[PDB]
């Protein structure tokens, strides 16, 4: 199929695009490069075995979206573009609602004008919020997300659900990713954000290669076993495989198809730090810090729905995620060329 991958030079997107190209799909990447490096493109192409088209631009530019969709006869859209830092969103709400809500609205408006009716949305475990039972299950209601990032993702889910009710030929996947970590097994593609990483694992990896002095751990007084936050860590390669399976299986199947994509087990921040220390051979330096706004104490997935319906499940462990990120970072301590 001919796939538009917004945010496709980013972390999840770059891994997804490799898998898409390996499966014979045609890939067009749209990215504004605010949180990724252009030089990942040829790495995607070498690992994927096929050339992806690149367009530098912004999902908020509806005119450009419409041009792309038409110029390439796109079949399906995988949407990764947006801003993703929970704590940052509390400080910069308008930027998150603009990139995430308006940006998705602009993209789906261009899709409706171009008659493209297959959408795979990068949602988040943060749409559940504080109320729902853990592990999270898709058949029980969401609650109140705890940050503008989380709220933005739930607002887009709702907008997309109401679009599909009005326009019932659409197929829309709401894929609630949990916490992807890890890197491609070659060690030549991994996470490389712009500036200081907001996510846990790339920060730890940059400490381990000597770029940053110490990890700050955001909270040690949570109601968790060791007092640090607990999350469901999923290897980015398993995540990317799930996304591709969803895209293929759900294209042209009308409805709103909701899946948790996670490993189904929780690990704490200190668990991740310990996993990485064993992979790299040295204790990763850290210090405790206050809780980050927008963080819940603990959550993890029930990913049985994706197992039953998509025949997908995780295959890699947290230790293997830490090993693959260390393999990447140690090979490329400054990330991609710039």
Ligand X SMILES: NC(=O)c1ccc[n+]([C@@H]2O[C@H](COP(=O)([O-])OP(=O)(O)OC[C@H]3O[C@@H](n4cnc5c(N)ncnc54)[C@H](O)[C@@H]3O)[C@@H](O)[C@H]2O)c1
Ligand Y SMILES: O=c1ccn([C@@H]2O[C@H](COP(=O)(O)OP(=O)(O)O)[C@@H](O)[C@H]2O)c(=O)[nH]1
Query: Which parts of this chain interact with ligand X (CB under 6 A)?
Result: 6-7, 9-13, 31-36, 58-60, 80-84, 99, 103, 122, 124, 177, 179-180, 199
Q: What is the largest CA-CA distance in the chain?
A: 56
**Is 58 annotated among the ligand-binding residues?**
yes
Q: Classify residue 39 by its DSSP letter.
A: G
Smallest distance, Å, CB 336 to ligand X? 11
In this complex, which beta carbon is closest to its own copies, that of residue 13 or of residue 103?
A: 103
149 has catalytic annotation? yes
Q: Which residues of 186-220 are buried (b: 16+ CB within 10 A; e: fewer)?
A: ebbbbbbbeeebbbbbbbbbbbbbeebeebebbbb
Cα distances from 167 to residues 62, 108, 171, 256, in angstroms, run 20, 12, 10, 11
Smallest distance, Å, CB 151 to its own copies? 6
**Is 295 annotated among the ligand-binding residues?**
yes
> With CB cut-offs between 5 and 8 Å by kind, which of ligand Y, ligand X, its own copies, none does residue 93 bind?
its own copies
CA pair distance 102, 152, nearest whole angstrom: 10
**Is 34 annotated among the ligand-binding residues?**
yes
Using the rule CB under 8 A, is 166 a contact of its own copies?
yes
Dihedral sign (CA 14, 6, 80, 209): positive
Smallest distance, Å, CB 288 to its own copies? 25
In this complex, which beta carbon is closest to ligand Y, that of residue 118 or of residue 329?
A: 329
| Cβ neighbours of residue 195 closer than 8 Å, sequence gap 6 or more | none
Q: Which of 149, 222, 233, 336 is catalytic?
A: 149
User: Where do the DSSP E strands lie in 83-190?
Assistant: 118-124, 171-177, 179-181
Smallest distance, Å, CB 34 to ligand X? 4
Residue ranges that bind its own copies, judged by CB under 8 A: 90-94, 97-98, 101-102, 105, 108-109, 112, 148, 151, 155, 158-159, 162-163, 165-166
List, by residue number, the catalytic residues: 149
């Amino acid at each position: 199929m001919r796939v538009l991958v917004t945010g496709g030079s980013g972390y999840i997107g770059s891994h997804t695009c490799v898998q898409l190209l390996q499966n014979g799909h045609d890939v067009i990447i749209l990215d504004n490069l605010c949180n990724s490096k252009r030089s990942v493109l040829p790495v995607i192409e070498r690992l994927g075995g096929k050339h992806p088209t690149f367009v530098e631009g912004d999902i908020r530019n509806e005119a450009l979206m419409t041009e792309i969709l038409h110029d390439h006869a796109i079949d399906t859209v995988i949407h990764f573009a947006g801003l993703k830092a929970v704590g940052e969103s509390v400080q910069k709400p308008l930027e998150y609602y603009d990139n995430n809500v308006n940006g998705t609205l602009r993209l789906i408006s261009a899709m409706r004008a171009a008659n493209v009716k297959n959408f795979i949305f990068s949602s988040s475990a943060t749409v559940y919020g504080d109320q729902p039972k853990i592990p999270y299950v898709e058949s029980f209601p969401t609650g109140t997300p705890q940050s503008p990032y989380g709220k933005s993702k739930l607002m887009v889910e709702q907008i997309l659900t109401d679009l599909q009710k009005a326009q019932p030929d659409w197929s829309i996947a709401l894929l609630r990713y949990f916490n992807p970590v890890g890197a491609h097994p070659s060690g030549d593609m991994g996470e490389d954000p712009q500036g200081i990483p907001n996510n846990l694992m790339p920060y730890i990896a940059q400490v381990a290669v000597g770029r940053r002095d110490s990890l700050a751990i955001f909270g040690n007084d949570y109601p968790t076993e060791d007092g640090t936050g607990v999350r469901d860590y999923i290897h980015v390669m398993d995540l990317a495989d799930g996304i591709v399976v969803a895209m293929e299986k759900l294209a042209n199947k009308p409805g709103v198809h909701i899946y948790n994509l996670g490993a189904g087990v929780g690990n704490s921040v200190l668990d991740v730090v310990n996993a990485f220390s064993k992979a790299c051979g040295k204790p990763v330096n850290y210090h405790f810090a206050p809780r980050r706004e927008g963080d819940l104490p603990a959550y993890w997935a029930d990913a049985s729905k994706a197992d039953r319906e998509l025949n997908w499940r995780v295959t890699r462990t947290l230790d293997e995620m830490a090993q693959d990120t260390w393999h990447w970072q140690s090979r490329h301590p400054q990330g991609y060329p710039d």
